[PDB]
Design a protein around this ligand. Structure first.
Ligand SMILES: O=C(Cc1ccc(-n2cccn2)cc1)OC[C@@H]1CCCNC1=O
Length: 167
């Protein structure tokens, strides 16, 4: 039993809710919140900008030190950093950004990072300003993640479309 509330169960291990991932993280304080990161951990907009804003820019400060030490992530890769006031840990995962021409096949590799964590609160990777089809992202999530994932979808219209079209 965990504290996630109001989710629709899609599969044995994948759950979905129309929710603001920031507000959801603040309420649940999950062990792991996933950020929709880029390789530079520049949290300017989308989910990343919103999560970083909620940390009063502490996420960005920590991220800049991480990059200065380690260099950029790979597309499809991840790193574990602090969850600040939102979660114990933040798993920064880089899905391919279609508006940069990145290969969508890398979306499966991106979701594989979730399997290193037993339970996660997450957005749909490569959705939103990353330019991929969220229906495709949900399919890859379900077919790749084996650990327990609680997906937060900000847009109610998109949420309803994702549920109604889910196979
Ligand atoms: O960026 C996102 C994710 C997102 C993904 C897809 C869409 N989308 C709309 C139409 C088509 N796709 C919109 C948003 O979350 C925004 C965050 C989360 C909550 C806190 N404040 C924010 O701004």
């Amino acid at each position: 039993v965990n504290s996630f509330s109001g989710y629709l169960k899609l599969t044995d291990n994948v759950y979905i809710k129309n929710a603001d991932i920031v507000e959801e993280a603040k309420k649940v304080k999950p062990t792991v919140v996933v950020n929709a990161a880029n390789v530079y951990l520049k949290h300017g907009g989308g989910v990343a900008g919103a999560l970083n804003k909620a940390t009063n820019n502490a996420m960005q400060v920590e991220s800049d030190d991480y990059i200065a030490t380690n260099g950029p992530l790979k597309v499809g890769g991840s790193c574990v950093l602090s969850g600040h006031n939102l979660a114990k840990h933040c798993l920064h995962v880089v899905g391919p950004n279609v508006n940069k021409g990145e290969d969508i096949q890398l979306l499966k590799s991106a979701y594989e990072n979730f399997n290193q964590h037993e339970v996660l609160l997450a957005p749909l990777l490569s959705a939103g300003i990353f330019g991929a089809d969220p229906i495709h992202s949900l399919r890859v999530c379900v077919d790749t993640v084996r650990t327990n994932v609680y997906l937060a979808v900000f847009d109610k219209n998109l949420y309803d479309k994702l549920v109604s079209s889910f196979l």
